[PDB]
Design a protein around this ligand. Sequence first.
Ligand SMILES: O=c1ccn(-c2cccc(OC(F)(F)F)c2)nc1-c1ccnn1-c1cc(F)ccc1F
Ligand SMILES: [Mg+2]
Ligand SMILES: [Zn+2]
Length: 313
Amino acid sequence: GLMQFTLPVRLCKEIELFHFDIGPFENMWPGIFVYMVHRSCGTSCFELEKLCRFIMSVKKNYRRVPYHNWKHAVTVAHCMYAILQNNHTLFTDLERKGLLIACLCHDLDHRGFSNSYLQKFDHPLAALYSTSTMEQHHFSQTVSILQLEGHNIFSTLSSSEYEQVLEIIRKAIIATDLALYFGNRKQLEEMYQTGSLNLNNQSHRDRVIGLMMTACDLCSVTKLWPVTKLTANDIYAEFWAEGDEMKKLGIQPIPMMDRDKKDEVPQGQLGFYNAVAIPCYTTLTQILPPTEPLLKACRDNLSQWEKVIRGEE
Ligand SMILES: O=c1ccn(-c2cccc(OC(F)(F)F)c2)nc1-c1ccnn1-c1cc(F)ccc1F
Ligand SMILES: [Mg+2]
Ligand SMILES: [Zn+2]
């Protein structure tokens, strides 16, 4: 109980900021996560020994792919940590408990391939889960780990609170399916503008949590420009590998995934910022005003990509 985890001064301060980068030292990530759970949730929410053992199994079950890896998981957990910490009073106890876990577990056992490729390859997971294929698998892996011996970090919850946290985690993980993002944000926008948005409507909270999960998931676009620009290299390494596997299946990939159309990346990013990221952090800032720094960082990077196209970098 009286073991408060502590980061060096620079991290201790910078970890509070939305644009924090967890750094290249892999063996510090688990401790960064535990620091966040304790500050966000309490040193009581989890038995340290089970938490440590859960984290390390979750790590083992992420793969050495270029983007969808252990570092992405911990990055997406930190963004949620910054949103929870900047909206102290808006979230219940279970929610704070489930969401950080859900963020750490949301891409479990990702092989670096889109749902589309799994469907076209005719992967067994595509027969097991017809929609949100990888996202149903990720949740499945989370439950499986929770059910290992000494791995049940939710042991002290009652049967009610236990089903409530697993359902929070399931909706949060399912919501990271970008195909579901667009519909969800539109309804949130319409609700917020007609003033029907009501954070006591459980159905409405579900949507707000989904949008937060998209915002956390996409948070490489909210970093300082060098991080955002270097993360893009890892993102496109996976897109181009999937483009290669599409061509092996005798299908021309969309240009995003075609490494022969590398030239088009900077314009492809503009579209994604205009169609996806900016609308995402705008609707989020409207519903949760203290998240405005993610909108501002995202606009700044949109501006940086506009400077790439114009030959100014
Ligand atoms: O930079 C990017 C360019 C394109 N897409 C993308 C992914 C999926 C469908 C898509 O098309 C559509 F616009 F219609 F959705 C575009 N995503 C990113 C991106 C930025 C940050 N995270 N990710 C990301 C999210 C992901 F979910 C997966 C991989 C990523 F790199
Ligand atoms: Mg995913
Ligand atoms: Zn992800």
